[PDB]
Write a protein that binds this ligand. Structure first.
Ligand code: HEM
Length: 390
C-alpha cells in the first residue's frame, strides 16, 4: 500500500507516484502519515466531483472510528459536528464575507503593494551588504510578505508585528510539543486582547468583523473567534509563501520564461500567476473529506466514514485535461485548475492570494532585471530557500 507523503527529486517537479496511481485508478487506497487508510483522488474529473459533492464533508458521523491523516492544525482529521456541518459552514462563509469584500480587498491591495516594496528593499539591502553573495528571496520576500498581509487582514497593531510573527512561528511547527502548546494559548490570548481593542475602536478588519458577529450572536464565543482568526493564519500564510517562492523558481529556472515575463509583466502576469497556481505542488496529503454515506465513484466503492484525500496537486497535472501537464506554459488557453479547490469550500482567500501573487511578480522583475538563480513535502513543510542574485 502506498504510504504518504510521496517523494520527488526536485522542488519544481511533482512526486512521480501520483501519475503511477492515476494511470491505474482515479481513486486509490493509501496510508496517511498517521498510519491509517484513506482514498487518494488523483484525477481532475474525480477531484472536481468530490469537491462539488455534498455527500463528502469535513465532519465524520462517528469521529472516534475515523482514519486520522496527521497531527497538523488543519486538514488532519474529522472537523466539526456531523449533524450541523453545512449550517456551520454557511455561517462561517457569511461571517467572513465582509473581510474579503471588494472595498476591503481594494484597501488590502494597496497595503500589499507597499509591503512588497518594503520586502524588495530588504532584499536589495541584503545584496548590497554581501556583495558577490546570493541572497535568499524566501527570507526577505516569500516568507514575510503573506504573514504581514495576514496582520493587515486580521487587524494586528503595527507595533505588534514582530510579537505576532513570533507567536505564529511557534504554533506553525504543529509538533505537539510543550512550547507549541503554550504558544497556542498565548496566541489565542493575543487574539482576545485584540478583540477587546476592536470593541473599543472598530476597524475594517477581520477581528472587528468577528466581534460584531458576537454582539448579534452570543453563541459565537471568544474561543470560536480566536479559532477562526488562528485558522486564517494557517490557511493564508505558508500556502501563499510557497507560491511566491515556487513561482519565482519556475520563472528563473528557464531564462526564456523569465525574459518573456520581464518583457511585458503587466500583460503576462494574470496568465503567469494561473500557471504558477496550477503547477506548484507542495502537499504531503491532499484536501480532506469523509464520506457521509456510501458513494460509488469511478468504479470505487467509498464507504460511509471513509477518509478521502483530494490531491489538487495531482489533479492539476491530469494529462487528459492539461496536455504536456508538467510543462510550464503561461499561455495555456483554458487554464481552469483546482489549486483553490471548487464547490462550497473553494478558497475564500483566492482573490487575496491572486492579488498577492499578481502584485509581487511584476514588482520583482521590474526592480531586478538581472534576476537569476544562484525530497518529500511535510504537512507542517515550510518554504524552500530561493537563493538569487543579479
Ligand atoms: C491568501 C491567503 C489565503 C487565505 C486567507 C485562505 C483562506 C482559506 C480558507 C478560510 C479556506 C476554507 C474555505 C472553506 O472551507 O469554505 C481555504 C480553502 C482552500 N485554500 Fe486558501 N487561503 C489563502 C490562500 C491560498 C493559497 C495561496 C492556496 C493554494 C494555491 C490555497 C488553497 C486552498 C484550497 C485548496 C482550499 C480548499 C480546501 C478544501 O477544499 O478543504 N489557499 N483557504
Amino acid at each position: 500500500t502506498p504510504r504518504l507523503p510521496f517523494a520527488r527529486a526536485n522542488a519544481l517537479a511533482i512526486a512521480p507516484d501520483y501519475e503511477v496511481l492515476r494511470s491505474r485508478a482515479p481513486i486509490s487506497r493509501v496510508l496517511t502519515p498517521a498510519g491509517d487508510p484513506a482514498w487518494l483522488v488523483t484525477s481532475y474529473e474525480e477531484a472536481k466531483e468530490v469537491f462539488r459533492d455534498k455527500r463528502f464533508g469535513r465532519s465524520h458521523p462517528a469521529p472516534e472510528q475515523a482514519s486520522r491523516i496527521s497531527n497538523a492544525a488543519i486538514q488532519d482529521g474529522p472537523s466539526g459536528d456531523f449533524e450541523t456541518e453545512e449550517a456551520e459552514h454557511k455561517r462561517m462563509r457569511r461571517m467572513l464575507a465582509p473581510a474579503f469584500s471588494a472595498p476591503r480587498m481594494r484597501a488590502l491591495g494597496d497595503r500589499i503593494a507597499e509591503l512588497t516594496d518594503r520586502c524588495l528593499d530588504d532584499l536589495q539591502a541584503a545584496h548590497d551588504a554581501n556583495p558577490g553573495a546570493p541572497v535568499d528571496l524566501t527570507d526577505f520576500l516569500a516568507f514575510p510578505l503573506p504573514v504581514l498581509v495576514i496582520c493587515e487582514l486580521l487587524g494586528v497593531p503595527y507595533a505588534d508585528r514582530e510579537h505576532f510573527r513570533g507567536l505564529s512561528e511557534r504554533i506553525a511547527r504543529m509538533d505537539g510539543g510543550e512550547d507549541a502548546q503554550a504558544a497556542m494559548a498565548e496566541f489565542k490570548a493575543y487574539m482576545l486582547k485584540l478583540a477587546e481593542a476592536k470593541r473599543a475602536d472598530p476597524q475594517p478588519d477581520v477581528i472587528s468583523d468577528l466581534v460584531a458577529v458576537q454582539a448579534d450572536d452570543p453563541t459565537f464565543t471568544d474561543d470560536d473567534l480566536s479559532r477562526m482568526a488562528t485558522g486564517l493564519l494557517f490557511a493564508g500564510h505558508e500556502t501563499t509563501s510557497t507560491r511566491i517562492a515556487m513561482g519565482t523558481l519556475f520563472l528563473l529556472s528557464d531564462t526564456a520564461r523569465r525574459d518573456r515575463f520581464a518583457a511585458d509583466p503587466d500583460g503576462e502576469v494574470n496568465q503567469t500567476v494561473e500557471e504558477i497556481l496550477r503547477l506548484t505542488a507542495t502537499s504531503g496529503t491532499g484536501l480532506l473529506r469523509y464520506a457521509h454515506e456510501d458513494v460509488e465513484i469511478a468504479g470505487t466503492r467509498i464507504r460511509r466514514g471513509d477518509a478521502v484525500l483530494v490531491s489538487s496537486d495531482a489533479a492539476n497535472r491530469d494529462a487528459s485535461v492539461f496536455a504536456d501537464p508538467d510543462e510550464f506554459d503561461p499561455g495555456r488557453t483554458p487554464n481552469v485548475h483546482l489549486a483553490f479547490g471548487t464547490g462550497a469550500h473553494v478558497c475564500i482567500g483566492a482573490n487575496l492570494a491572486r492579488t498577492e501573487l499578481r502584485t509581487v511578480f511584476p514588482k520583482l522583475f521590474r526592480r531586478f532585471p538581472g534576476l537569476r538563480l544562484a525530497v518529500r513535502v511535510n504537512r507542517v513543510g515550510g518554504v524552500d530557500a530561493v537563493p538569487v542574485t543579479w
